Amino acid sequence: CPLMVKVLDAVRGSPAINVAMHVFRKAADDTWEPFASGKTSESGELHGLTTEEEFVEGIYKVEIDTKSYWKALGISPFHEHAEVVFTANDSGPRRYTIAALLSPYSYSTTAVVTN
Amino acid sequence: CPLMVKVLDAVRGSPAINVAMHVFRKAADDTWEPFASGKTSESGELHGLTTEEEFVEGIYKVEIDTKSYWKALGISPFHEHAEVVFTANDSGPRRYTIAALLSPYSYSTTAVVTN
Amino acid sequence: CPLMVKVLDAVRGSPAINVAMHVFRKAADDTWEPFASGKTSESGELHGLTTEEEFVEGIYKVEIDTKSYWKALGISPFHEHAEVVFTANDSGPRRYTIAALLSPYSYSTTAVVTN
Amino acid sequence: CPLMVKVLDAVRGSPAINVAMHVFRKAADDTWEPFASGKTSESGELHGLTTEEEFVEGIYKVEIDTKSYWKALGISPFHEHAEVVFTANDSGPRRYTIAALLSPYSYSTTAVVTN
Numbered sequence: 001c002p003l004m005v006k007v008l009d010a011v012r013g014s015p016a017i018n019v020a021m022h023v024f025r026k027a028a029d030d031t032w033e034p035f036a037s038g039k040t041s042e043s044g045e046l047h048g049l050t051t052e053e054e055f056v057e058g059i060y061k062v063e064i065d066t067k068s069y070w071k072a073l074g075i076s077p078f079h080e081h082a083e084v085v086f087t088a089n090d091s092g093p094r095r096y097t098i099a100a101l102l103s104p105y106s107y108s109t110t111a112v113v114t115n
Numbered sequence: 116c117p118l119m120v121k122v123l124d125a126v127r128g129s130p131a132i133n134v135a136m137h138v139f140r141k142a143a144d145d146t147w148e149p150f151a152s153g154k155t156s157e158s159g160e161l162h163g164l165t166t167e168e169e170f171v172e173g174i175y176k177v178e179i180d181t182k183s184y185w186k187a188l189g190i191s192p193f194h195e196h197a198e199v200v201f202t203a204n205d206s207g208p209r210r211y212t213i214a215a216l217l218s219p220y221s222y223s224t225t226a227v228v229t230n
Numbered sequence: 231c232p233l234m235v236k237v238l239d240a241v242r243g244s245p246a247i248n249v250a251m252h253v254f255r256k257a258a259d260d261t262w263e264p265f266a267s268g269k270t271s272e273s274g275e276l277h278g279l280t281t282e283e284e285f286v287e288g289i290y291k292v293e294i295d296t297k298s299y300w301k302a303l304g305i306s307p308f309h310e311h312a313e314v315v316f317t318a319n320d321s322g323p324r325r326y327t328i329a330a331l332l333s334p335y336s337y338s339t340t341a342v343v344t345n
Numbered sequence: 346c347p348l349m350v351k352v353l354d355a356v357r358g359s360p361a362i363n364v365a366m367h368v369f370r371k372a373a374d375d376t377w378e379p380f381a382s383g384k385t386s387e388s389g390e391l392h393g394l395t396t397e398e399e400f401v402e403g404i405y406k407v408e409i410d411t412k413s414y415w416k417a418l419g420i421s422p423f424h425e426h427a428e429v430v431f432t433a434n435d436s437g438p439r440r441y442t443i444a445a446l447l448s449p450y451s452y453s454t455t456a457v458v459t460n
């Protein structure tokens with residue numbers, strides 16, 4: 001699988017478990033069509049979203065439901081969700097790991113792209 | 116000035132100057148309506164986007180054109196744009212400062228909210 | 231004001247107020263000599279630490295007492311302090327703004343350096 | 346092994362390979378004594394620094410040589426090193442993963458503590 005998402009909780013110092021997210025692919029009319037989705041595991045990771053053959057070049061959006069995560073912990077957050085929008089680019093063999101580090105009023109997102 | 120956006124460049128250690136961004140507000144039909152737009156100044160800040168009267172309760176999206184910023188510096192970055200989606204003014208008027216810290220393969224977005 | 235430090239709280243979305251910090255400068259014998267100290271204001275900023283004449287070339291360390299900040303809010307954080315170590319003024323005088331973004335189990339430190 | 350360190354490069358979107366670091370433990374006289382050291386692997390990770398029996402409660406410092414990493418890439422950095430200072434605390438079974446996300450003028454450090 002060429003795309004994995006990892007989510008971490010900066011308040012508790014833990015993987016962020018049971019975080020829902022949807023992946024969309026941008027269509028020719030500039031709309032977002034659903035592509036894949038799931039929830040993070042006990043390790044904070046979501047594997048198996050797609051396959052090499054399906055994950056073609058294009059613009060993708062990962063929408064991570066961070067608000068529901070914080071609400072379950074009883075903490076008021078700022079963001080409605082965390083958004084990661086990127087172009088997949090074929091330059092040799094590539095695997096994408098997207099990490100989201102979550103705080104109630106801040107998040108960071110990083111891509112590690114490896115061969 | 117109930118909404119201000121500040122953008123910083125983590126490669127150069129500088130304000131990110133001339134960064135374009137568009138603000139949208141979610142309409143009753145769930146579409147994103149244009150709300151305001153502008154570019155960061157030499158200080159990396161964009162002031163004057165809206166007014167207290169115009170900045171009603173709602174869900175807002177700030178799309179910061181980080182890709183064009185990096186490309187003009189000779190860097191091909193990961194993200195298409197940095198996106199910040201948030202509910203504003205749900206408990207009455209607040210002042211929002213959104214800061215985006217940019218690197219080619221990572222960014223963070225933080226909000227300081229004051230009454 | 232060639233050195234300013236700003237501290238933000240990513241849990242509350244606010245300036246981090248009354249945060250103590252100590253600045254040290256490396257002496258010729260490799261020990262850390264006291265240089266300046268202070269606490270952040272209601273804006274989360276600490277101004278006036280030094281002057282252009284006093285802030286000579288050297289290696290400086292800013293130790294920000296993040297642990298006491300979190301403990302007073304009822305949180306037991308991971309880090310003892312946030313540490314920022316840097317060479318200053320190696321190519322002539324510069325102005326340094328150091329920002330620390332704090333969460334209980336994570337922090338970031340960023341510098342904006344201007345001529 | 347109860348302590349692992351992972352280092353990521355936010356400019357290239359990659360693990361930060363061959364990054365040297367030293368771990369110190371604070372002594373009773375407030376000096377830092379060497380405890381362990383190594384360099385990150387091709388995955389950006391440094392494993393095997395210590396053992397359960399050796400890693401007792403106390404204050405530890407991880408000093409990551411980020412300046413040498415950026416210098417090898419020909420990029421001028423801000424920090425002399427990245428410093429992570431924390432107290433190890435016995436509260437049930439615990440494994441510490443310290444992640445450092447590096448940019449030339451900014452870094453973030455996060456602890457994920459798991460059972």
Ligand SMILES: O=C(O)c1cc(Cl)c2oc3ccccc3c(=O)c2c1
Binds near residue numbers: 216327328329340342
């Ligand atoms: O007000 C400033 O001059 C200033 C300078 C720096 Cl380095 C800053 O870095 C940051 C890094 C992460 C999140 C927010 C900020 C800031 O809000 C910020 C503001």
Ligand SMILES: O=C(O)c1cc(Cl)c2oc3ccccc3c(=O)c2c1
Binds near residue numbers: 101443444445453457
């Ligand atoms: O592989 C891990 O266990 C692990 C642990 C931590 Cl704390 C991590 O923090 C991070 C903080 C910012 C950006 C990426 C990561 C990680 O990719 C990451 C991975």
Ligand SMILES: [Ca+2]
Binds near residue numbers: 057089090
């Ligand atoms: Ca291509």
Ligand SMILES: [Ca+2]
Binds near residue numbers: 204206
């Ligand atoms: Ca309301």
Ligand SMILES: [Ca+2]
Binds near residue numbers: 287319
């Ligand atoms: Ca010099």
Ligand SMILES: [Ca+2]
Binds near residue numbers: 402434435
């Ligand atoms: Ca104990």
